[PDB]
């Protein structure tokens, strides 16, 4: 009936539509986040730059840097001068909290020659003796969805092993397995806790085979 109010209406309908367009392109945020990306490079350069440290010992980094033996890394005692070793971002107790599941494919350029297929390790157990706190003893289960022929046949086995804080790499050996079942070894070199580089290795020589990558399957 009365003008000025009648115009003001149409502004509210447009405005109500432009608040939805935000929600469509809000989920496109988090798709590519910078704070996560610079971590991916800075960590990847931080390998080829070379660890000044020598032979499986933990390298502090920051204002100052020097070696510390792998067995003191997260011990609940100050070992490095600036305390980089007792921090949350390095200790970060749980990247292997039970229930996490990892998945991904695997090419095979080593023994046990077969077609390229999908695998998925799932962590079962976890333990931390509060006297010797430095490593995480844990169980897990390893799954193979390969198709041999005439069906989709699924291998499985149980594996024990542990997980360093220093080197950020878990290692699984099969237990009580008379059958072959070649062991798996990961590493979380990405600086982030989702992705991981793994390759399945013979238990003795430790030379590689079957380079596979994995991703953290979505929680909840």
């Amino acid at each position: 009936l009365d003008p000025r109010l009648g115009a003001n209406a149409f502004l509210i309908i447009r405005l109500d539509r432009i608040i939805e367009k935000l929600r469509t392109k809000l989920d496109e945020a988090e798709k590519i986040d910078p704070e996560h990306f610079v971590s991916e490079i800075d960590a990847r350069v931080e390998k080829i730059e070379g660890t000044h440290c020598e032979k499986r010992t933990f390298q502090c980094g920051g204002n100052e840097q020097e070696c510390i033996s792998d067995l003191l890394v997260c011990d609940g005692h100050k070992d490095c001068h600036n305390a980089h070793d007792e921090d949350p971002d390095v200790c970060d107790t749980s990247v292997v909290k039970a229930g996490n599941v990892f998945s991904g494919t695997s090419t095979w350029h080593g023994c046990l020659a077969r077609e390229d297929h999908v695998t998925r390790i799932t962590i079962t157990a976890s333990k931390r003796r509060k006297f010797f706190t430095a490593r995480i003893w844990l169980r897990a289960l390893v799954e193979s969805e390969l198709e041999r022929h005439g069906e989709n046949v699924t291998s499985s086995f149980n594996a024990k092993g542990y997980y360093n804080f220093a080197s950020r790499r878990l290692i699984l050996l099969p237990t009580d397995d008379h059958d072959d079942h070649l062991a798996v070894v990961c590493s979380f070199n990405r600086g982030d806790n989702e992705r991981a580089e793994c390759h399945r290795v013979t238990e003795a020589t430790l030379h590689q085979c079957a380079d596979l990558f994995v991703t953290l399957e979505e929680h909840d």
Binding site: I19, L26, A29, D33, P34, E35, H36, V38
Partner: peptide, 20 residues
């Protein structure tokens, strides 16, 4: 929405990429 925008990552200041 102001919260859900600011509960995502900071803008990563020019200084880190400079020295990367």
């Amino acid at each position: 929405i102001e919260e859900e925008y600011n509960k995502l990552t900071h803008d990563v200041d020019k200084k880190t990429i400079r020295q990367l």
